[PDB]
Structures are given as structure tokens and as C-alpha cells.
């Protein structure tokens, strides 16, 4: 098994901040070069902005940080679900994890004060 | 998994059955509901019983052919959905079927007469002999379903007795809940895309201009299981219409537009066509209805005294949203 | 329309159209139930006995039973061995890409209600989550014997079809 | 007009109706050539069961891949079938007993072989799949390519004949057979003739495990039944030209030596006798042939693609020639021409 | 009339007869139910049928041949033979040049451990 | 290129985030004059490339600070 | 840019498994492969965590399905090796004229299946005929079939019956003959001949670098077999040849197994001549259940017989990596106790693990035909891989 897959990489860990920085702005270029792909490939329901709302969301959930490696391995978890979306590898049941919100709108009686909370004892 | 179902937790229902719903909402969970669904094998009920079996409600399903009953049974887990055959002739049946539901619904609508079943069968009469039976058993929520254009008057013998099943369930068993939804639209349905999807002819009158807005099933099954369980639903005609009222050269040109086919068009007048369509019922599969044919001039008759969309917290989608997915695989 | 009718479990031919459309059935029914093309989908310890079955001691040619590997061809389908999330969007388009007249039989253990695996993170907890499936055939080595006598199982079940029948509407 | 057409009827219910009970004795041999019985409870011993297998087969439908144009998947089915059909023509079944008699006889069962080929590299373009396009490839390539020496040797036949008509070569055979002079080409044939089959001493094309669940096109219904019959009426078809041109057509012995002591004149009991004795010389030299295929397609795995190639052009085709260089020699050394 | 061009004309009509059985005898004919860039070859596919030409080919030259062998006695037996013997050393170019050899690159990497 | 930059224009007002679609000037910088953030860079990038279908190298990517910078690239096709 | 390329199997491609596997073709050649595995993978080191030693047992007939037998083994032997205990000397020949019919078992499945794969039809049926025999053997001892509710990590289940020792002589006495008849189509063979002379090469530097064992390695050279290497139940006190292959390929891997064949049969008459009588169990009620005739009478019985069935036995604290020599390989398995007595953790080394784990590095430059022989000779069962 001396050689890769098409685009998986050698793992090595940046020493620097900026470094991760500048990998981690080549990744979400990535995902985002490679989003109408995606459409096409796991053949979803919606529109390619859709997609790419979520790729921008979902590194907003994680620009808070501090630590370098935590950063680290946040990075690897990243381009192997970039390295498993580029491909047919995940299938698009698995695909569609991502859009839980899209698909369906909630339904009736979404528990928002104490009161609907209560009557259901918290669901 | 959360009661998205449901209000609350604790239900007594309208004849006075306690109905907790233990456990947290999911597939495993248990409602309380027992529900009957009449003709669920039919393409509203699929969609209808998996989102009522969804969250956990016994679906006591009543089937006619063995086989087209099966493909129901993966929405619901152990004991939630429940088989039992029966026709509509036999009574017993009947009241056999509905004796511990909770609520009942009956979507039994057929375009077309068989040998063996007529519109004054299925339609007015059949309604009668079961909610007699629920009558007799003080059954709660009774829903009925009826289409839309549902008049007293001739021209389409089916919409000539819709409304007379309508007053038949106002007769009997009174407080009984009626709605009426648009034409509808979904993946296969049953005569309004997947025979606009393939076609070798594409005939019909009007010169296609018949009007009314169609409303995608997924929304017409969230409205049902939205009206099933609340109260300010009781004995009120529901007319269910979707958000912008289309014309045929419209719904098919967005159809073309995607498909990106030439769709053929014939549209020849009404003499020549009747004497075609009377030939189609001596043959076991089913074909377009002679009696299809007149609803082909008629057009949606929205009663402004009834109760929408809005009422219980919905927006159905619009059917420009929807065209490539639906007869995406026609591509 | 009469008030009482029996049900198609206790109904009878009396009409000579029904003597006529009882035979046809018949015939359509028995050559489905010879002729019986199931898809070799097996996995695991649950499917060297479903080679078991088309071994030289409890042959299945003899039954007419015989593994298309190819789904277009198959009528049914035997779900045998474990069933895991990786696997079960492949086991619904396995389904899907089925001719009508179809069944499904859920060979094994842990192929009905999760089996062994009941509460391991990546598994299906039975088949039923996926396709609806009208017989289970027991065992978690099921035995082939008992494979067998849940084909024969599907097979009375076959016997019971009615699919000429309901034309009439019974 | 009238005894013409039940003259093609009965020959249908003779090769239609037999083609059928072909495939089920397939199954008979396999169970014991692997120590295992046949089908045994569908029938009275278990026969008909083809019947059960067609009857159901037409009962499923017709789910059609969305990437083939099903005019194209309608074209190839039923022209693979009436080609392994048309070509029964003139099959001989006894002296000059065929459907239609003419002088230009393996002409046309060549080329009508010629045109079996036609049908399966047409079928694996509908549904255009990369790998069920290289799939019809791979297949029409060999196709092609046995096909060469299956042509190639009917030409040495007829170096003993120099006649097209095909029951002049078996009232030329009556001196002697052409197998037992000529051995090693029955060898070179018989694997020529499961070559142009869809065979598994050959037929990798057919490997599921390969294709995305491809064996062809997995293009099931009534469709399935017309490549299936075609495949199995190209069975006995080539073990019908193995028949004549190669072996005893129809001739078993002498057997006037028997009939003078049996019937005193001609009458139809006679022309009865004496076809049936014909046909079934004819039968049984068919019957021991279709029960050979079987017993090569057990013993055996199956090939590489490089192998089948190589098996092809390098290690027979060669000795094809070597042929072609010793038998009009040996026509040249003796006077021995043939005339027509 | 003759039962010869009877039998071309009705196995079609066989065929109709088998091919409208389905559409007769079936129901629910059709419910709903990457390849971005390459193809791949060598030769060794393309070659076969391009080279099948002139052998398919020589067999119907070879084909009058057969049929009036005793009218050229002694003499198209020399003139088949030239032909024949030009063919043949135009088959025994391709296998000296091994035109259908697919072969492949796993070679055992021949070149040994030549070190510092 | 002319009216290479109205398309620019075109590109980047579709977007959010964007105080001033009329401070759309041909030397607007990203980060100070249009307001955007590390993640927006790229994001108007690859909506400029995929505006035009041509595809661009990671450190060419990298250092289109401004608008200007942009217009200074777009001529490598 | 890159191949066109393509899922193997889904469903059925390779028989008894879920083979999905990327190849990349640009002549018919891999350039290189990926088999993803996991679709059988259960989750079960997950799972043995939970539960008691006693009851963690049948986890691994579960994992190898083909050859139950061994999996049962090399977790009695990791935990007989674990607790510092003894099995006695009627059980130690029981187990390992057990672990050799099942090496029969094994060989008799592979070699036929992949003939099977590769095209040839009459093994397959052959094979698993004399497996349905041996399917009996099973049947006589312990449970039902294919799943063998024994060796326990104290030792034997139980005894056997009162006469299957005979009777398996008259099955061993028409094996040899049953054996020699398909070693009859397969071995000279021109066809497998021609598939089967080079193909996959596996060197001996490579074959080390892989990780490889069993009949690979002894098929590229390496006399390495843990029956002769590190010996244990009375392999020593039995004589047994082993044959080792000569080039790296797969013919030298079909020819070794059709070696132990008659290797394996030897074991059982050099076994069944020399049966000794004794406690088939451990001597001790500490560890296993006592039987039940006594336990019905003695007071002692009871408790050992109800702590065994609730809590369970308990296991000296530390760790273990016992690895047999399973007829798919070297089969591995390193259990880490608590001192509890449920396992800490317990890693399994699946054979084929490594085996799917080195196909790229030999299955360049093959065919795609050529790509199913290199398939079920390195006995993708699945069952194994991925658990
Ligand atoms: N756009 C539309 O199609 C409109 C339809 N509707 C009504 O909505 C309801 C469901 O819609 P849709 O899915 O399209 O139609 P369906 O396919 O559901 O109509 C047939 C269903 O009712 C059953 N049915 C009919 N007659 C009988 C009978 N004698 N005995 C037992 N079952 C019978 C059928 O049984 P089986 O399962 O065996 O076939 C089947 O379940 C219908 O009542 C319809 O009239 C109202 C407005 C719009
Ligand atoms: S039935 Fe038994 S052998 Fe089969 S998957 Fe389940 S546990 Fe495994």
C-alpha cells in the first residue's frame, strides 16, 4: 500500500498558528470549489448556496478555539470529510446528516416557554 | 426524538379514554392514539399512516389485496401498525375494524366504476354503512375526507356524489370533521404528473385552461395529523388550496421546461374522446375514467367560508419549488 | 351492495367465472411457486447457510430455488446475517431496483430485531427498519432445514397470492 | 397451403417445445455431475419446469434503466432470438428433409451465424454505463474472434464436398464420417463451438462480481426470456452443425441389408420407418452432443480475457493454417478432387 | 407459397406474439427507480476487430474457391497456394511483433541493490 | 478587460455582510473598505473564478487583498 | 484524470462477503485499489467489554464464520494463559483434533468458494457436501451447526458422545479418496494452470513487511508455522509435516492448502489411536461449572455453580497476546484484564485484517479477472476484517 488515494495527504502538524491558519483557508476554498460537485453527485433536493451557508456555519461553529492543536485535529476531522465527500464514498443518506433543519420544517407545538416545555414535561 | 406530534403529554380524548404518551417521541415511543386509517394502501394514506405511526399512534390498518398492504408495515414498530382485511360490503367488517380506535379517517375515493362498484357505492353509500358503525361506537375525531368541486349538481357523477357523502356524514354522527383538499401532487401520484411525466398521447379538453391550485401530499398528511389531535376542528368543512391557482398550459409548460422534451399535445374535442375512454373499462389495469372527462371542463370551486392552511399553523410549498425533483428522473 | 359478504379467507367458488379464475390463479401461482429466483444478498455467518442450502444434502435446485445474483431477475430477497448503518442505504437500493411481485425473507438472528447485536452503536436493529419483510426465518445459525420450511412458509403464503382473484374484487 | 404450414408447426413443436426441456435436462446432468438431484417438485419427475419458469417470467414487469433507449432494448432481444430461430432452416433431418431446400445451404447457415453476433454487441450499449459498455466490448471481441475459426473450418469441410447444399455433404458422408478421418479438427471444433456460445469454460463476460451487478444488462421480464432462448437455441443450433458437417449427419449404417428383410414393397409404414430410424440417427448423435456441452461446462473454470485471446490467435489459428496447408496437399498427392 | 419464405416472415410475428405478452400481462411498468472524466484502453481491444478484417475477409475470397476446386486441377491449387503462403507470413508479422500482448506493468523491479 | 470590473461589481454586491454596496469601488479592500473576513476572501474569490469558469492556484488565491488586486489577476486568461 | 473507477461488490461479487472495493483501471490494470471494509463491522470489541468471560465466548464464533473453531480456541488459550491454569490431557487432544476438522472445515470451504469465484463449479458443490458431513461432527459434540457453543476458557465444554470417535474414523478412512478426486480437475489443469502461475507475486521481505502469515507466508518460503514455531495442545505430541511453497505465488498458496488436507487427516489417525481417558474439563470448580450430577448433592457445587452464572470467574490483573495459528493465518487476540471479570479490553487480530490490508501493494498491475483470484486466496471472509 506504498501510494495514496487521489486527494488524501500525508498528516503533519503545523507549528504555528498562522500556519494552521493558512491550511485551514486552503480547505474551506476546497469544499467550496468542490460544492456544485457535490449537488451533482449526491444528486440533494436544494440549491448549491444552501450548501455553501452550511460549509461557511459550520467553521463558524469552531472560530473560537484557543489551542493550537485542538485546532490540530479539528483540521484532520475536516479534510476527511472533505476527502470523504470529493468521493462516493459516503452515500447520500449519509450525505444528508447535514441538513436535519432543511428537509422538514419542525411541526406543530416547537417548546419554547416554560409553559410547552411543562405540559410535555420537556419532551 | 421529541413530541413534535403532539401539544402536551396527557390526553384524555372526547369519549373519555385516558391516553398518556410515555416515553420521549421517537419510533420506539408509544402515543396512545389508536387510529384507523381506511384505504391507506392508497397514496395519501402511505404518506398519511407514516407520519401518524411516526410518532408511535396504533394505526389499526384495514387492507383489501394482500400484497399492496405490505409496504406499510416499516413506518410503524411492534404493535404500532395492525392489519385486518375487510370489503365494504361486509358490515361486520366494518364494525369489527374501528371497535378500540381512538380516531378514524376514510380516504376511499375511486375514479372510476368498476363491475362490481359504482360512484353511488363508494362514495355516498359505502360512507354510510361505516359511520354508522361509528355512530354506534361513540368513536372521537371522526374525519372524513371528500375532493374538491364537491357539489349537489350533475355534470361529473363523482362530484355529483361527493357532496352527497358530505351530507350523509353532516347527517349522521353530526359533530363529523370535512375536508376538502386541492388537486394534489407528489412523487407517483396518481393521475396528475405521473401522467404528464410519460405520456404517448397527452389528450384532453378545454384547451387546457381548467384552474386550480394543487397542493403537494406531504403538506395535505401534515395538515391531516395537525388537524387529528387538537381541538376547534369539530364539525368544520376544510377546504385545503394551494398557495397560487395555476392553469394546465402553465403546469405543463414548467413540467417541459425541466424535462426538456417536447410533451405532445392533441387536445381534440369531446365526441371522438367520450367513445375511446368507454372502450378502456373492459381492461383489468386502469386507464383514464369516461367520467374523468368531465371534470376536464370543471374547475376549482373555492367555498370562501371554510377553514385553511393558516388556520393550524402551515404553509404548503409552491409547485415551482418543487419540478425538479419530482420528474427528476425522467430526465 | 349486499350487507354481508364473506371475507376472501372463507370464500368459496360457486360462479363457473370463479371455477375459471381459481384454475388461472392456480397456474399463475404454481409457477410462481416453482419457479423461485432469490438474490444471494448473504454476509455472514448467516450466509455459508444459504450455501448450505444449495449444498448437495438440501438441495434447492430440486425446489427450484437458484441464486441470479442480480437483482433485476430476482423475485424475492433473503436479508441474511448481521445488518450495520454503513451497509443499509445499499440494502434499501437493493430493494428498489426489485420487479413488483416481490418478497423479502429475513434469514437469521440478527436480522430480525438487531439479534446479537441489539445494542451495538453501528447496526440496524432488524430489518424491518429498511424493508417490509413477510417472513423471518429463525436461528441464528439458521438452520437449513428451517430455511427450507420458511420457504415453504413464503411458498403457502404464495398459495395464498389471489392475484386473478381481485379482479373481481372478492 | 394447407399441409405447408402445419409442416412448419410440427417442426416448431419439435425444436421450440424441445428447446425448452433442453434447459431442464441442464440441471438434471449438473445435479449429477455434482452428486446432487435435479428438479424434482415442480412435475411428475420433475419435469416442465421451464414452463413454470417462463409463465412466472412473463407475469414480472418491465422496469427500464433510464439510461437505455428501450426501443434499442426491445430491437435486441427479439432479433438475438429469431436469429438463433431463422437459423433452422436447413438443418437436415434425413435425405433432403429440411424446411427449405436449397442449393446454398451453410451459406446461409453461416451467415445467419455470421449475424448472431449482431445482436449482443448491440444490446450492451443501451444503458450506457462504462462498465456495461466495455462489458459488450470484451464479449463481441471473442465473439468475433472464434467466429473467424467456426467459419474457417467450414470451408475445409467442403473441401471434401465443393457443394453449398448441405445434404449433399451427408450422402457424401455415407462412405465414411469426417470426424474419424479428420480428429483433431472435431477437438478444435467442439471448443470453437462453445466459444461462440455464451459458455463458461469461456464466457467470463458474464462475471457479476466484475460489473456494478452486471451480467449483460440485468434487463429482466419477457425481455430475459428472448436472449435466454436465444442463447439456448444457439446451443443446439452450432451442436446441429457439429452434427452434419463434422459427424454422422444422419446416417447410422447400411440398414438395407435389414429392410429387405422386413417390408416386402414401399409403403408410408416404410418412408415412416426409415425417417424415424433417420431422425433418430440424427438425434442421437444431437443428443450426445448437447449432453457434452454440459459435461465440458462443469469440469471447467473460467478464462482471462488475455487467455481467451491468446487462445484465439496464437495457439489455434496458426494450426488452422497448418491445416489449411495439409489438406489441399493431400487433396494434390492423390487425384481426389472433388466435383459437385 | 413455399413454406421457405413462410418461415422468415412468421418468426416475428412468433416474436410479437412473445414480445406483446408482457405489455398484455404486466402492471406498474415504471416507478421512480460519477462518469465525469475517463475511458481506458491498450491496443489489444482495439486491434482484434480491426485485424478480424482481412482473416474474416480472406475466407470469403477463399470461398469460390472451394466450390470449383476440381475444374482448377493441378493449377488453382498453385495460385490458392501463392495466396495462401502471402497470408500467412502476413499473420506470422503480428506474432513476431506480439500486436495482441496486453502486457503489464507489475514488473519484480528487475535492478538489484547497487549500494554506496 | 472592459466591463470586467461592472462583473466584479455584479459578483460581490450579491452577497451579505456588505455596508455599502455603492463603496463597491475598483480599489475597495476586502478585509477594511468592503468589511469582510478571512472566510469572505475566499468566498468572493472562488465566486469571481466560478463567475468566469477559469480555475486559480492556492497562493494566487491567497493575496487578492482588494478588488484592485483582482483586476490586477483577471488578465492571466 | 483519474480511472474510471469502480465499486467491486456491493451485494454478491466475492461469496461469503460484503467486498466494496475502489479500483482504479486505466488498461484493465490497477494502478491501485482501495477496498473499503466495515460493512459487516458490527462494533463487537465495543460490546465484549460489557460482559463476563463466560458469557464474552460466543463473540467469536461469530467473528470468522467459516472456521468457528479456531476463534474458540485462541480465546481459551488467551485466558487459560491469562488465569495460569492447566487443561488436562483428554482435553488438550480434544481441542486439537477439533482446531484441525476445522482446518479441514476451512480448506474445504476456501479452496472450493474460490474455485467457485474463479469459475469452476463442481468443488463448490463437493466441498460442501463433505462439510455437511462435517456440519455432523459439530452437531454430535456441541449446539447446532456452524456455531459451536464450546471451548471454554477453562477448557472443553463437555465430552463427547458415546461413539463419534469411531464414527469419525469411518468418515476419515474416504476423505483421502474424497479429496484426491477434486484434487483431480484443479491441480494440473491448464486453465487454473494459466490463471494460476505467477499471480500475485508476494516476495519474502514484503511478505514480513505485510505482516502476512499462515499459508501466504509459508507459500512465499518462510518455514513459519505456530503448530512447529511455538507449539502448544499436544501438536508437539503429535507428528505433522508442513509443506512450504516455493515462488510468491498464488499457486504456491492454492498448493499448500491442498497440502494440509493431507497433512490434517494425519492428525486425526495419529489422534484417534491415541484418545486418552481423563477429566475433559479443568480439574477445578473455580473456573468452570461442575457437572451436573453432583451438583444436585453437594453444597460446595452450588455456589461455585451460581457465582459462575452471575458474577462470573474471576481474572488475575494484566495482559495478554496469545496468536494461533488459525488456517486463515496467524490469528491474534490480546486481551487486557482488570482483575475484574469482565475483559478491560480485548483486541482481536483477524487474519484477513492484514491479508485485505496488503492487496494494493500485490494486486498492481493485475487484471480485473485477475483481480478475483488474488480475491479468495487471501480469504476475504469479512466476517474477519472489519467486527
Ligand atoms: N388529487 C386527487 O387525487 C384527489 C383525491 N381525493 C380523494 O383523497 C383520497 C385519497 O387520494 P388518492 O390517494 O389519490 O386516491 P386512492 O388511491 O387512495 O383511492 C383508492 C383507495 O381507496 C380504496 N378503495 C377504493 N374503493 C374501495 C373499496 N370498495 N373497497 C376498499 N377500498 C377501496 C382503495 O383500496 P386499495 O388499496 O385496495 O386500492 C385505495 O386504498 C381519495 O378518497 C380521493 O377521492 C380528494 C381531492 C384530490
Ligand atoms: S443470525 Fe447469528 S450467525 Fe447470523 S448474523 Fe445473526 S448472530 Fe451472526
Given at each position: ?123 | ?331 | ?170 | ?34 452428486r446432487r438431484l435435479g428438479p424434482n417438485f415442480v412435475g411428475y419427475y420433475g419435469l416442465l419446469q421451464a414452463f413454470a419458469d417462463a409463465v412466472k417470467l412473463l407475469l414480472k ?214 425417417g424415424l430410424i433417420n431422425s433418430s440417427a440424427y438425434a442421437i448423435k444431437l443428443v450426445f452432443l448437447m449432453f457434452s456441452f454440459i459435461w465440458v461446462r462443469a469440469a471447467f ?40 | ?116 | ?77 | ?175 483421502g479418496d474424497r479429496l484426491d478426486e477434486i484434487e483431480e480437475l484443479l491441480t494440473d489443469n491448464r486453465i487454473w494452470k494459466l490463471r494460476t502461475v505467477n499471480i500475485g507475486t ?186
Open positions: 500500500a506504498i501510494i495514496a488515494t487521489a486527494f488524501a495527504e500525508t498528516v503533519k502538524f503545523s507549528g504555528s498558528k498562522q500556519e494552521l491558519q493558512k491550511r485551514t483557508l486552503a480547505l474551506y476554498r476546497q469544499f467550496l470549489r468542490g460544492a456544485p460537485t457535490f449537488a451533482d453527485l449526491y444528486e440533494v433536493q436544494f440549491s448549491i448556496p444552501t450548501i455553501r451557508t452550511k460549509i461557511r456555519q459550520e467553521f463558524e461553529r469552531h472560530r473560537f478555539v484557543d489551542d493550537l492543536s485542538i485546532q490540530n485535529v479539528l483540521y484532520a476531522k475536516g479534510h476527511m470529510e472533505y476527502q470523504e465527500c470529493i468521493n462516493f464514498w459516503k452515500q447520500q443518506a449519509q450525505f444528508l446528516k447535514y441538513f436535519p433543519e432543511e428537509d422538514d420544517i419542525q411541526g406543530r407545538h416547537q417548546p419554547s416557554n416554560f409553559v410547552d416545555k411543562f405540559l410535555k414535561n420537556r419532551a | 426524538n421529541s413530541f413534535e406530534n403532539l401539544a402536551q403529554d396527557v390526553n384524555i380524548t372526547r369519549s373519555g379514554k385516558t391516553l398518556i404518551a410515555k416515553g420521549t417521541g421517537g419510533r420506539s415511543s408509544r402515543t396512545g392514539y389508536t387510529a384507523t386509517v381506511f384505504g391507506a394502501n392508497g397514496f395519501l394514506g402511505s404518506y398519511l399512516t407514516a407520519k401518524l405511526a411516526k410518532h408511535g399512534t396504533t394505526v389499526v390498518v384495514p387492507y383489501r389485496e394482500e400484497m399492496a398492504k405490505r409496504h406499510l408495515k416499516v413506518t410503524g414498530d411492534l404493535g404500532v401498525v395492525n392489519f385486518l382485511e375487510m370489503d365494504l360490503r361486509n358490515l361486520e367488517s366494518i364494525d369489527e375494524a374501528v371497535r378500540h380506535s381512538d380516531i378514524v379517517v376514510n380516504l376511499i375515493g375511486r375514479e372510476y366504476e368498476t363491475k362490481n362498484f359504482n360512484y353511488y357505492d363508494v362514495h355516498v353509500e359505502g360512507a354510510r354503512r361505516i359511520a354508522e358503525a361509528v355512530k354506534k361506537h361513540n368513536i372521537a375525531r371522526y374525519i372524513h375526507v371528500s375532493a374538491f368541486n364537491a357539489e349537489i349538481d350533475s355534470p361529473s357523477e363523482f362530484n355529483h356524489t361527493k357532496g352527497l357523502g358530505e351530507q350523509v356524514t353532516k347527517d349522521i354522527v353530526p359533530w363529523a370533521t370535512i375536508v376538502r383538499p386541492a388537486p394534489m401532487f407528489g412523487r407517483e401520484d396518481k393521475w396528475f404528473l405521473d401522467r404528464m411525466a410519460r405520456s404517448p398521447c397527452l389528450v384532453s379538453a378545454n384547451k387546457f385552461q381548467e384552474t386550480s391550485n394543487p397542493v403537494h401530499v406531504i403538506d395535505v398528511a401534515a395538515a391531516l395529523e395537525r388537524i387529528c389531535f387538537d381541538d376547534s376542528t369539530v364539525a368544520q368543512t376544510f377546504e385545503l388550496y394551494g398557495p397560487q391557482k395555476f392553469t394546465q398550459k402553465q403546469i405543463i409548460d414548467m413540467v417541459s421546461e425541466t424535462l426538456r422534451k417536447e410533451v405532445r399535445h392533441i387536445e381534440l374535442p369531446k365526441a371522438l374522446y367520450q367513445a375511446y375512454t368507454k372502450a378502456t373499462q373492459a381492461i383489468w389495469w386502469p386507464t383514464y375514467s369516461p367520467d374523468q372527462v368531465e371534470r376536464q371542463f370543471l374547475s376549482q370551486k373555492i367555498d370562501p367560508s371554510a377553514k385553511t392552511f393558516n388556520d393550524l399553523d402551515l404553509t404548503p410549498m409552491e409547485l415551482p419549488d418543487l419540478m425538479f425533483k419530482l420528474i427528476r428522473p425522467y430526465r | 351492495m349486499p350487507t354481508d359478504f364473506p371475507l376472501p379467507s372463507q370464500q368459496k367458488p360457486n360462479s363457473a367465472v370463479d371455477y375459471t379464475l381459481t384454475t388461472l390463479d392456480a397456474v399463475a401461482n404454481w409457477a410462481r411457486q416453482g419457479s423461485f429466483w432469490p438474490v444471494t444478498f448473504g454476509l455472514a455467518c448467516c450466509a455459508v447457510e444459504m450455501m448450505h442450502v444449495s449444498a448437495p444434502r438440501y438441495d434447492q435446485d430440486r425446489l427450484g430455488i437458484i441464486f441470479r445474483a442480480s437483482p433485476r431477475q430476482s423475485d424475492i430477497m433473503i436479508v441474511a446475517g448481521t445488518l450495520t448503518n454503513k451497509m443499509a442505504p445499499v440494502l434499501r437500493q437493493v430493494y428498489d431496483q426489485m420487479p413488483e411481485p416481490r418478497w423479502v425473507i429475513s434469514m437469521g438472528s440478527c436480522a430480525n430485531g438487531g439479534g446479537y447485536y441489539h445494542f451495538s452503536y453501528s447496526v440496524v436493529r432488524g430489518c424491518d427498519r429498511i424493508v417490509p419483510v413477510d417472513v423471518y426465518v429463525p436461528g441464528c445459525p439458521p438452520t437449513s432445514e428451517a430455511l427450507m420450511y420458511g420457504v415453504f412458509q413464503l411458498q403457502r403464503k404464495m398459495r395464498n397470492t389471489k392475484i386473478t382473484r381481485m379482479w373481481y374484487r372478492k | 397451403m394447407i399441409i405447408n404450414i402445419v409442416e412448419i408447426l410440427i417442426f416448431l413443436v419439435c425444436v421450440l417445445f424441445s428447446v425448452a426441456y433442453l434447459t431442464v435436462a441442464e440441471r438434471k446432468t449438473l445435479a449429477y455431475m455434482q414487469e418491465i422496469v427500464l434503466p433510464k439510461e437505455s433507449n428501450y426501443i434499442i432494448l426491445v430491437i435486441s432481444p427479439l432479433i438475438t432470438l429469431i436469429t438463433a430461430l431463422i437459423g433452422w432452416v436447413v438443418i437436415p433431418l434425413g435425405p433432403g428433409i429440411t424446411l427449405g431446400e436449397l442449393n446454398l445451404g451453410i451459406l446461409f447457415s453461416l451467415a445467419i451465424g455470421s449475424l448472431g453476433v449482431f445482436g449482443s454487441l448491440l444490446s450492451g450499449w443501451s444503458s450506457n454505463s462504462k462498465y456495461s459498455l466495455l462489458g459488450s466490448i470484451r464479449s463481441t471481441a471473442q465473439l468475433i474472434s472464434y467466429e473467424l475459426i467456426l467459419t474457417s473450418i467450414f470451408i475445409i469441410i467442403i473441401m471434401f464436398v465443393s457443394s453449398l447444399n448441405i445434404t449433399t455433404i451427408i450422402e457424401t458422408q455415407r462412405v465414411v464420417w469426417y470426424c474419424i478421418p479428420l480428429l483433431p479438427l472435431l477437438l478444435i471444433f467442439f471448443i470453437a463451438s462453445v466459444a461462440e456460445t455464451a459458455r463458461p469454460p469461456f464466457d467470463l463476460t458474464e462475471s457479476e462480481s466484475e460489473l456494478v451487478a452486471g451480467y449483460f444488462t440485468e434487463y429482466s421480464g419477457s425481455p430475459f426470456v428472448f436472449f435466454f432462448l436465444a442463447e439456448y437455441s444457439n446451443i443446439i443450433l452450432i451442436s446441429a452443425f457439429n452434427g452434419y458437417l463434422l459427424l454422422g449427419g444422419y446416417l447410422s449404417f447400411n440398414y438395407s441389408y435389414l429392410f429387405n428383410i422386413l417390408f416386402n414393397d414401399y409403403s408410408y409404414v416404410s418412408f415412416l420407418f426409415e473454470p473460467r478464462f482471462t480475457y488475455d487467455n481467451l485471446i491468446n487462445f484465439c490467435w496464437i495457439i489455434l489459428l496458426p494450426l488452422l493454417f497448418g491445416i489449411f496447408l495439409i489438406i489441399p496437399s493431400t487433396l494434390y498427392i492423390f487425384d481426389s478432387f472433388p466435383t459437385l | 407459397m413455399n413454406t421457405f419464405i413462410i418461415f422468415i416472415i412468421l418468426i416475428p410475428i412468433v416474436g410479437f406474439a412473445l414480445l406483446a405478452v408482457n405489455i398484455l400481462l404486466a402492471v406498474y411498468k415504471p416507478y421512480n427507480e460519477f462518469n465525469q472524466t475517463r475511458l481506458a484502453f491498450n491496443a489489444a481491444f482495439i486491434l482484434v476487430a480491426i485485424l478480424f478484417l482481412p482473416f474474416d475477409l480472406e475466407i470469403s475470397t477463399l470461398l469460390p474457391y472451394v466450390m470449383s476446386i476440381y475444374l482448377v486441377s493441378n493449377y488453382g491449387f498453385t495460385i490458392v497456394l501463392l495466396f495462401l503462403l502471402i497470408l500467412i507470413i502476413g499473420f506470422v508479422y503480428e506474432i513476431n511483433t506480439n500486436a495482441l500482448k496486453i502486457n503489464k506493468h507489475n514488473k519484480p523491479n528487475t535492478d538489484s541493490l547497487i549500494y554506496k | 478587460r472592459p466591463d470586467a470590473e461592472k462583473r466584479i461589481a455584479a459578483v460581490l454586491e450579491s452577497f451579505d455582510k456588505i455596508s455599502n454596496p455603492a463603496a463597491i469601488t475598483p480599489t475597495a479592500s476586502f478585509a477594511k473598505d468592503l468589511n469582510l473576513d478571512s472566510l469572505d476572501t475566499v468566498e468572493v474569490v472562488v465566486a469571481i473564478e466560478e463567475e468566469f469558469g477559469i480555475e486559480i492556484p492556492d497562493k494566487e488565491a491567497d493575496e487578492i487583498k482588494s478588488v484592485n488586486q483582482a483586476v490586477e489577476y483577471i488578465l492571466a486568461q | 484524470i483519474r480511472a474510471f473507477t469502480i465499486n467491486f461488490g456491493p451485494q454478491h461479487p466475492a461469496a461469503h462477503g460484503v467486498l466494496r472495493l475502489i479500483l482504479e483501471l486505466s488498461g484493465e490494470e490497477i494502478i491501485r485499489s482501495d477496498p473499503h471494509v466495515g460493512l459487516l463491522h458490527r462494533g463487537t470489541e465495543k460490546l465484549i467489554e460489557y460482559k463476563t468471560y463466560m458469557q464474552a465466548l460466543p463473540y467469536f464464533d461469530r467473528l470468522d464464520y467459516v472456521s468457528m473453531m479456531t476463534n474458540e480456541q485462541v480465546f481459551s488459550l488467551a485466558v487459560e494463559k491469562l488465569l495460569n491454569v492447566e487443561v488436562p490431557l483428554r482435553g488438550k487432544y480434544i481441542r486439537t483434533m477439533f482446531g484441525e476438522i476445522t482446518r479441514v472445515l476451512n480448506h474445504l470451504m476456501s479452496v472450493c468458494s474460490h474455485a467457485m469465484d474463479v469459475g469452476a463449479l463442481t468443488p463448490f458443490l463437493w466441498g460442501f457436501e463433505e462439510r455437511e458431513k462435517l456440519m455432523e461432527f459439530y452437531e454430535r459434540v456441541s449446539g447446532a451447526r456452524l456455531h459451536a457453543a464450546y471451548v471454554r476458557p477453562g477448557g472443553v465444554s463437555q465430552d463427547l458422545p458415546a461413539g463419534l470417535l469411531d464414527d469419525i474414523y469411518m468418515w476419515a478412512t474416504q476423505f508476494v516476495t519474502a521481505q514484503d511478505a514480513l513487511n505485510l505482516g502476512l502469515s499462515g499459508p501466504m507466508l509459508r507459500g512465499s518460503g518462510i518455514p513459519f508455522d505456530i503448530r512447529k514455531n511455538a507449539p502448544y495442545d499436544a501438536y508437539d505430541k503429535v507428528d505433522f509435516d508442513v509443506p512450504v511453497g516455493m515462488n510468491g505465488d498464488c499457486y504456491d498458496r492454492y498448493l499448500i492448502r491442498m497440502a494440509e488436507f493431507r497433512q490434517s487427516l494425519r492428525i486425526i489417525e495419529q489422534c484417534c489411536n491415541d484418545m486418552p481417558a481423563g477429566a475433559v474439563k479443568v480439574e477445578d470448580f473455580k473456573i468452570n461449572s461442575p457437572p451436573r450430577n453432583l451438583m444436585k448433592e453437594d453444597m460446595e457445587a452450588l455456589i461455585h455453580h451460581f457465582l459462575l452464572y452471575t458474577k462470573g470467574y474471576s481474572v488475575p490483573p494484566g495482559e495478554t497476546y496469545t496468536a494461533i495459528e488459525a488456517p486463515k493465518g496467524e490469528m491474534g487476540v490480546y486481551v487486557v484484564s482488570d482483575g475484574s471479570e469482565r475483559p478491560y479490553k480485548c483486541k482481536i487480530r483477524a487474519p484477513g485484517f492484514a491479508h485485505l490490508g496488503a492487496f494494493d501493494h500485490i494486486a498492481r498491475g493485475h487484471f480485473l479477472p485477475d483481480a478475483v483470484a488474488i480475491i479468495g486466496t487471501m480469504d476475504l471472509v469479512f466476517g474477519e476484517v472489519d467486527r
